[PDB]
Design a binder for this molecule. Structure first.
Ligand SMILES: *CCC(=O)N1CC[C@H](C(=O)N(C)[C@H](C(=O)N[C@H]2Cc3cc(O)cc(c3)-c3ccc4c(c3)c(c(-c3cccnc3[C@H](C)OC)n4CC)CC(C)(C)COC(=O)[C@@H]3CCCN(N3)C2=O)C(C)C)C1
Ligand SMILES: Nc1nc2c(ncn2[C@@H]2O[C@H](COP(=O)(O)OP(=O)(O)NP(=O)(O)O)[C@@H](O)[C@H]2O)c(=O)[nH]1
Ligand SMILES: [Cl-]
Lengths: 170, 165
């Protein structure tokens, strides 16, 4: 058989939400920044032997359109919370994203994964330990990724799928 | 004392679409109006001519003005890369309002947008400095090349631009 998941990628502008999604879907990376309004992708994958359609909503990093934001969170089955390891503000935003998801879902138990992107860059401002500790406090997985080298890209999305699968079947 | 008017000859994949003219509110927003005027004549050696309307979203706006990177991220003012928000006297009252695009407070460059509807949630955040005079029908046509994510179905460019007498 097959399953299907609505994955939503959120996080501050410029952290690499689109680059991560394009690496997962299309297996390439470009340095050029094309700021997102909203994009959706669909891809059939096999994760742990189980075939699934991934529907990926790539959102814009913006804080002005709360009604749209809330609808993305209402429909999403799991969330990648993305920050960049060289963008301290993006890490400080992470707790806001989680609070917003909990508010919309009216729940403390929502599938999500914390993603520290741009791990290839030597300009780090956010320590790995600080991100690990935050994710542990939320009870969610943490993974460091690079859309440029592809490190951790499949693992980030597949980990989120596993979080959803567990939630559904428990 | 009369506000200046500038014109944009719009093209679709290089073929003429029509002309849009704008009144620039030099009387109430002088620094912002002067930037757009000078970018429209090209008198500083750079400006709008040849650049695209890269982001068009039906029901909302037509946005353009990136003549430095040609990818929606660039542009620059006659005063430097960015200049401060001059005032917020004027509001996004309906179709044809001309307003500055930005990336937050005090980041005006060259990118701008033409409202195709009232966009009042931008009041106090984007500096309104002009309006369409003639050619709203051309703006309505440009709007039809847009889409929900802003990508255009053909290349919409400012083939010529300048100041009217
Ligand atoms: C953190 C952000 C940041 O720092 N950035 C740096 C680069 C980039 C940036 O600011 N620029 C490239 C600016 C620029 O273009 N400024 C824009 C403001 C802007 C910028 C970006 O990148 C995205 C959005 C706005 C954005 C994203 C998602 C949106 C959205 C706008 C709108 C909607 C929406 C809301 C309600 C209902 N439907 C929708 C859409 C149709 O649903 C898909 N969404 C989805 C939540 C609002 C609008 C009105 C539909 C579109 O608004 C714009 O495009 C605005 C309009 C005013 C002028 N704009 N663009 C800007 O000034 C450059 C100038 C350097 C990000
Ligand atoms: N070195 C490096 N650069 C990256 C990485 N991921 C993204 N970038 C770069 O960072 C910039 C922004 O990436 P992008 O994916 O567009 O960010 P976004 O989060 O989708 N931004 P928005 O919210 O505006 O849509 C681009 O120049 C992109 O090439 C990464 O892992 N490493
Ligand atoms: Cl906006």
């Amino acid at each position: 058989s097959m399953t299907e998941y609505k994955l939503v990628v959120v996080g501050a502008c410029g952290v690499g939400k689109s680059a991560l999604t394009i690496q997962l879907i299309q297996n390439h990376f470009v340095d050029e920044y094309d700021p997102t309004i909203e994009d959706s992708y669909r891809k059939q994958v096999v994760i742990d032997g189980e075939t699934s359609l991934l529907d990926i909503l790539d959102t814009a990093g913006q804080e002005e359109y709360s009604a749209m934001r809330d609808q993305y969170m209402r429909t999403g089955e799991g969330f990648l919370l993305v920050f960049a390891i060289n963008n301290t503000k993006s890490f400080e935003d992470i707790h806001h994203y989680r609070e917003q998801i909990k508010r919309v879902k009216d729940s403390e138990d929502v599938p999500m994964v914390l993603v520290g992107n741009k791990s290839d860059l030597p300009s780090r401002t956010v320590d790995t330990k600080q991100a690990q500790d935050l994710a542990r406090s939320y009870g969610i997985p943490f993974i460091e990724t690079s859309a440029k080298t592809r490190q951790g890209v499949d693992d980030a999305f597949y980990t989120l799928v596993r979080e959803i699968r567990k939630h559904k079947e428990k | 004392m009369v506000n200046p008017t500038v014109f944009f000859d719009i093209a679709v994949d290089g073929e003429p679409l029509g002309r849009v003219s704008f009144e620039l509110f030099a009387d109430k927003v002088p620094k912002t109006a002067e930037n757009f005027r000078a970018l429209s004549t090209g008198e500083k050696g750079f400006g709008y001519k040849g650049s695209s309307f890269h982001r068009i979203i039906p029901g909302f706006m037509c946005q353009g003005g990136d003549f430095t990177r040609h990818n929606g991220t660039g542009g620059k003012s006659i005063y430097g890369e960015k200049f401060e928000d001059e005032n917020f006297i004027l509001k996004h009252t309906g179709p044809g309002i001309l307003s500055m695009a930005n990336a937050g407070p005090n980041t005006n460059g060259s990118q701008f947008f033409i409202c195709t509807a009232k966009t009042e949630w931008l009041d106090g955040k984007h500096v309104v400095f002009g309006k369409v005079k003639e050619g709203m029908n051309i703006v309505e046509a440009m709007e039809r090349f847009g889409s929900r994510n802003g990508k255009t179905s053909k290349k919409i460019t400012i083939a010529d631009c300048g100041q009217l007498e």
